Write a protein that binds this ligand. Structure first.
Ligand SMILES: [Cl-]
Ligand SMILES: [Mg+2]
Ligand SMILES: [Mg+2]
Ligand SMILES: [Zn+2]
Length: 718
């Protein structure tokens, strides 16, 4: 928990196809924006812990002088076991992936899982230490103890004795934080790009400094605010120049990116971000963010700045982040073909044509492949900007990061819990393709299908009530939505889960259709394997979903998980040997389970089960039959310890065999003349390290010197 396990999962982001299909101009745009993002992500070290910048500098020197493979021999010569050496690599990979020594998931410190005395032998005997003996000794003295310290006040991000933070000086309390917020509010000044430093005089009187992040120092709209203030008896000073040499690098790259931008919204947003990072102006960043919202469906999508305020103990200061995510043009093309045949494909669905929408509208779904996501962590989706005023007047972007979602489940053979040995190789090979098919169907044909029957305030219907027949009754429709009731309002508790279930089930049902598979590029045995793995993944995910059921509250904590479990329950109810979940004894003697899906019964048993289930789901949804809908859905979503599945017992097994969150390796891009190439790394701790070793080829040592200088300037505050 305060360590990352030696066997931590690792996945590499796949942006290969998408990047290949970028034009030369879009490649150069993505190249410079990626450089901007990776440069800026370095500031996150300063925004994490006093020691983080030095740890980064030290690890970076170490791995530059010796590859993880060259250091390996050195480590063994110093008497580290293979496991101790792996513990170091995992630790370094963790620092790099979090931009600091605190997990971005949980905000808890992590330390190396090996004796400090052994690590010291490796560091001080390294080639880096041979090249710069005083500097490496100095870095180790500076960060060695803190690298390992689990003093209670350092275990978590926070204030005082409860935690550590570099958003504020070490002497700050929540009272200080609130006072600063009141001051900033009074001056209409955003906290997002700020830190708070408190000096205390001989009499214990506090003096406050609000420091803005900017290239420019304290030697536009910002200029007038850089001065002294008195606020409720407290002196306040507003200054700027935080992270200046890092932001200078960011700005250089944003300026270069402008040459390759796709439209004037992109050109203007980048000019505004440059002003923001140069002057320290959130007002400028908001203007840029407005332009960004106006830039609809760009091929190369990006955002950059002090965006999220989760890690500030007070919750108002942003952590730096930057991303570049791209439209996969091949996937766009496939989706367009799916949409072009939507009329025909919809007719295959198990409800009557009268229960279908009068005309097909492509749902508002956007998926992009991440090329770069810099900072402390990579989310599987984005929903931004966070500026409430802008969200209301202009809107926001809500986008899936498809290649990050694609590695949500296990991507390594040895991590495939609950699968039979003979399914493991297939699963690893066909997982990616099956995901692409499932997503496209789910989002487009799943959420894009089905009509609600509505009676309005005048008594008028949106369907032909004289002639539409409920296939379950053989009679005219007698149940419908009234009083402006909606799906969400009528089916309060289950609306979201039931709809995801219906959409996921459309995915499984339509992935059987040879025309769908042909669009996605699959025929023959390969198409059969894509089908099988899609279904296998779904049933395994329904077992795994039990983590998100709370037995004591008889309550499901996550809509999507509940939906997956329901699908499992539908396929189990079908019987005939299609799917079984059996509690077993693991190879280690502890409780385990086996998911067995008979591929030969998917069409003959699975298809008709989903036919019946989907027909029921839609009829009950269309007619707004909440009592019927609740009975059906809550029935399947019920978790009991009944044999032979013993799902409550299995939930414990699921939690037992649960492993920590995986690390994600990201690619690099390299410029040669006007050509940009993609560099990829192995999915391992060594691979992730190498990805960072190669990330700053022009100026890595300059950046490390910048980081340690900035850290040293502020060291007295902690
Ligand atoms: Cl009815
Ligand atoms: Mg503290
Ligand atoms: Mg992909
Ligand atoms: Zn959905």
């Amino acid at each position: 928990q305060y360590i990352l396990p030696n066997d931590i999962g690792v996945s590499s982001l796949d942006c290969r196809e998408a990047f290949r299909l970028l034009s030369p101009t879009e490649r150069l745009y993505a190249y410079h924006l990626s450089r901007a993002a990776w440069y800026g992500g370095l500031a996150v070290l300063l925004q994490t812990s006093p020691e983080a910048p030095y740890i980064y500098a030290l690890l970076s020197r170490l791995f530059r002088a010796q590859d993880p493979d060259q250091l390996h021999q050195h480590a063994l010569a110093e008497g580290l076991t293979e496991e101790e050496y792996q513990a170091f690599l995992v630790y370094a990979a963790g620092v790099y992936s979090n931009m600091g020594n605190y997990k971005s998931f949980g905000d808890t410190k992590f330390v190396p899982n090996l004796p400090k005395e052994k690590l010291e032998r490796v560091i001080l005997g390294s080639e880096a230490a041979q090249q710069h003996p005083e500097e490496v000794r100095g870095l180790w003295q500076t960060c060695g103890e803190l690298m390992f310290s689990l003093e209670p006040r350092l275990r978590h991000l926070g204030l005082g004795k409860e935690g550590i933070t570099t958003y504020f000086s070490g002497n700050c309390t929540m009272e200080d934080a609130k006072l600063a917020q009141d001051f900033l509010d009074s001056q209409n000044l955003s906290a997002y790009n700020t830190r708070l430093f408190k000096e205390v005089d001989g009499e214990g009187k506090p003096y406050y400094e609000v420091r803005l992040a900017s290239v420019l120092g304290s030697e536009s709209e910002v200029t007038s605010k850089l001065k002294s203030y008195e606020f409720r008896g407290s002196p306040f000073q507003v200054t700027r120049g935080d992270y200046a040499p890092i932001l200078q690098k960011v700005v250089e790259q944003l300026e270069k990116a402008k040459a390759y931008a796709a439209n004037s919204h992109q050109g203007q947003m980048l000019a505004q971000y440059i002003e923001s990072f140069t002057q320290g102006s959130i007002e400028a960043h908001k203007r840029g963010s407005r332009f960004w919202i106006q830039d609809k469906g760009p091929i190369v999508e990006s955002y950059i700045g002090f965006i999220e305020s989760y890690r500030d103990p007070f919750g108002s200061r942003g952590e730096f982040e930057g991303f570049v995510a791209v439209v996969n043009k091949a996937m766009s093309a496939k989706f367009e073909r799916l949409v072009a045949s939507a009329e025909q494909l919809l007719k295959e669905l198990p409800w009557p044509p009268t229960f279908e929408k009068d005309k097909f509208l492509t749902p508002d779904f956007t998926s992009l492949d991440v090329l770069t996501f810099a900072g402390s962590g990579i989310p599987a989706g984005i929903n931004i900007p966070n500026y409430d005023d802008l969200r209301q007047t202009e809107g926001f972007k809500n986008v899936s990061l498809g290649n990050v979602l694609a590695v949500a489940y296990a991507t390594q053979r040895e991590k495939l819990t609950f699968l039979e040995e003979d399914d493991k190789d297939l699963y690893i090979l066909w997982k990616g393709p099956s995901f692409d098919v499932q997503v496209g169907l789910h989002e487009l044909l799943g959420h894009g299908s089905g009509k609600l029957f509505v009676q309005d305030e005048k008594g008028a219907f949106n369907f032909d009530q004289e002639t539409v027949i409920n296939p379950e009754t053989g009679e005219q429709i007698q149940s419908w939505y009234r009083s402006g009731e909606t799906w969400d309002s009528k089916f309060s508790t289950i609306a979201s889960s039931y709809e995801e279930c219906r959409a996921e089930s459309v995915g499984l049902y339509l992935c059987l259709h040879p025309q769908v598979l042909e669009i996605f590029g699959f025929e023959g045995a390969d198409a059969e394997d894509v089908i099988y793995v899609n279904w296998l993944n779904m049933v395994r995910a329904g077992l795994l979903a039990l983590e998100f059921y709370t037995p004591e509250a008889f309550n499901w904590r996550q809509a999507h998980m509940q939906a997956r479990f329901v699908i499992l329950r539908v396929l189990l109810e079908a019987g005939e040997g299609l799917v079984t979940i059996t509690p077993t004894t693991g190879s280690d003697g502890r409780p385990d389970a086996r998911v067995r899906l008979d591929r030969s019964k998917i069409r003959s048993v699975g298809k008709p089960a989903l036919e019946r289930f989907l027909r029921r789901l839609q009829v009950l949804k269309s007619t707004g039959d909440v009592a019927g809908g609740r009975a059906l859905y809550e029935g399947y979503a019920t978790v009991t310890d009944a044999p032979p599945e013993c799902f409550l017992t299995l939930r414990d097994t699921v939690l037992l065999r649960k492993e920590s969150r995986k690390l994600i390796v990201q690619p690099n891009t390299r410029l040669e003349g006007s050509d940009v190439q993609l560099l990829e790394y192995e999915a391992s701790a060594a691979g992730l390290i190498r990805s960072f070793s190669e990330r700053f080829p022009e100026d890595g040592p300059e950046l490390e010197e910048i980081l340690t200088q900035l850290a040293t300037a502020d060291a007295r505050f902690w």
